């Protein structure tokens, strides 16, 4: 039994330093912010503003000259200049207290550089996989973190880098420092821990900068996840329209009313009455038929794929329910 994963969005603010760089970024190209350029201009200018705002929402020290001037010192301000670092400082402190180990994912390898200095400044043992790490080295980092009685506590990874199907079930908590445009890259990052072999409840903390760009980024990726799940559940609707008729289906069509046909010594239902007609009788037919039509349409148009799908055992015709 594998326990379903808990996913919690941690909406976070920005330090005064972040606000400064956030304004500085918007001011550098404020005419693009106001949407004053022509519709012909490339996406490049807007995409650049987007990435710099993500760097600002992650940590100000991603920009050169941001961190206070020389001499450069690792300090407490490495934590108190970024809204996520403050939330992370206490979140990790509480994670280590309850005996939980944590994987931390990020989009940017320069941010894991900042987290490396934080881990030593706080005394945390850790591993790290960037995607610039070779095949054999990241194997040792996996096994080191997975070792029975391991010394490590935090695992630093970039969202895409691990590969596919790696096992980090020795950790129980996943911290997404920042999210991906592709919701499947992040879900693959959560499933590093939430997969067969995990015995404890997997909890995923997705850091989100509230009232900023990352809040609107969250909704665009949430829709993409929802739109994805809709394609997936209809993946068998392709076959159903394509599928030809069963031996079970053809048999049911022919047998429909076959007994009453064999019983009829005269004529079938409608023609039993007259067979010549009164416009009252024809207007009675159309009214009765329109009633049956509306019932049929409303009955089927509310169905989904799970009601119209034919299992493959349908064409595995064995015997008759009761004989004909």
């Amino acid at each position: 039994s594998l326990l379903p994963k808990k996913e919690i969005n941690v909406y976070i603010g920005m330090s005064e330093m972040q606000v400064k760089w956030y304004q500085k970024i918007l001011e550098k190209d404020i005419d693009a912010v106001n949407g004053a350029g022509g519709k012909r201009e490339s996406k490049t200018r807007l995409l650049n503003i987007v990435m710099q705002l993500r760097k600002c929402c992650n940590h100000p020290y991603l920009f050169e000259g941001a961190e206070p001037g020389p001499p450069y010192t690792t300090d407490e301000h490495l934590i108190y200049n970024a809204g996520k670092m403050v939330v992370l400082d206490k979140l990790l402190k509480r994670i280590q207290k309850q005996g939980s180990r944590v994987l931390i994912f990020s989009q940017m390898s320069r941010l894991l550089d900042i987290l490396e200095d934080y881990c030593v400044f706080r005394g945390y043992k850790y591993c790290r996989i960037d995607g610039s790490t070779a095949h054999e080295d990241r194997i040792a980092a996996i096994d080191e973190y997975n070792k029975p009685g391991s010394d490590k506590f935090i695992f630093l990874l970039t969202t895409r880098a691990g590969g596919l199907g790696i096992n980090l079930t020795t950790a129980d908590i996943v911290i997404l420092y920042d999210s991906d445009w592709n919701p499947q890259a992040d879900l693959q990052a959560m499933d590093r821990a939430h997969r067969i072999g995990q015995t404890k409840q997997v909890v995923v903390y997705r850091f989100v900068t509230d009232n900023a760009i990352e809040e609107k980024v969250l909704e665009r990726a949430a829709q993409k996840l929802r739109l994805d799940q809709l394609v997936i559940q209809q993946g068998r609707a392709q076959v159903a329209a394509k599928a030809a008729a069963n031996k079970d289906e053809l048999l049911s069509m022919i047998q429909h009313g076959a007994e009453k046909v064999f019983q009829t010594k005269g004529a079938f239902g409608t023609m039993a009455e007259k067979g010549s007609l009164d416009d009252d009788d024809i207007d009675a037919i159309l009214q009765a038929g329109e009633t049956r039509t509306k019932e049929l349409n409303a009955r089927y148009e509310k169905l989904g794929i799970d009601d119209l799908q034919k299992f493959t055992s349908e064409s595995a015709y064995e015997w008759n329910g009761e004989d004909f």
Binding site: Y61, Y72, T74, R110, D113, I114, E116, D117
Partner: peptide, 5 residues
């Protein structure tokens, strides 16, 4: 020194 450099 520090990794963020």
């Amino acid at each position: 020194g520090a990794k963020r450099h």
